[PDB]
Every structure is written in structure tokens, then in C-alpha cells.
Amino acid sequence: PRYQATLLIELKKGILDPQGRAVEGVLKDLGHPVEEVRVGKVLEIVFPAENLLEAEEKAKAMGALLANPVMEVYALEALKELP
């Protein structure tokens, strides 16, 4: 079957986030008070797998390839079988 994995690659605590600091400014300029904005990457990956167990394994494996050890962590935010 075909699966779609939603992976989030986000910055670890303490790692600087200039992109986020900028969005904060943008929202603040638009009357939208914000305490913090952390910008990460989201990857929607569509791929085949024999079953859900392999889907999850391949999903997490790819997530590991995407995250920088020092700066980031990955999370499999969602995983669904495509109709």
C-alpha cells in the first residue's frame, strides 16, 4: 500500500532560531501578541510499504537522516495509509 508520513524537524532548546525570532516580529506588528515562535521543517513524504509496521519503520528511518544531531530532533507527527 501507499503511505504518507508527516515529519517535523525542529530545533532543540537553546539553539538559535532567527527565522522564528522574525515571525515573532511579524505577528507582533500585526497586533498578535506571541510569547514564542519556533520554526522547524515539515516534510510530507508519500512512499510504499508492505504494511503499517514497515511504514512506521521507514518513516522514522528517514526522519533520522533529516535531523542534524546537534541542532535538531525529528518527530513522526502523522502516518496514514493512502486510499
Q: Tell me which residues touch a copy of itself (CB under 8 A).
A: 2, 6, 8, 10, 20, 23, 26-27, 30, 32-48, 58, 61-62, 65-66, 77-78
3-state secondary structure of 79: strand
* For a copy of itself, the closer CB: 48 or 81: 48
* For a copy of itself, the closer CB: 31 or 70: 31
* For a copy of itself, the closer CB: 30 or 70: 30
What pairing do the DSSP bridges indicate for beta strands 2-11 and 72-81? antiparallel
Separation CA 66–CA 64 (nearest Å): 5
For residue 82, count other CB atoms closer than 10 A to its CB: 10
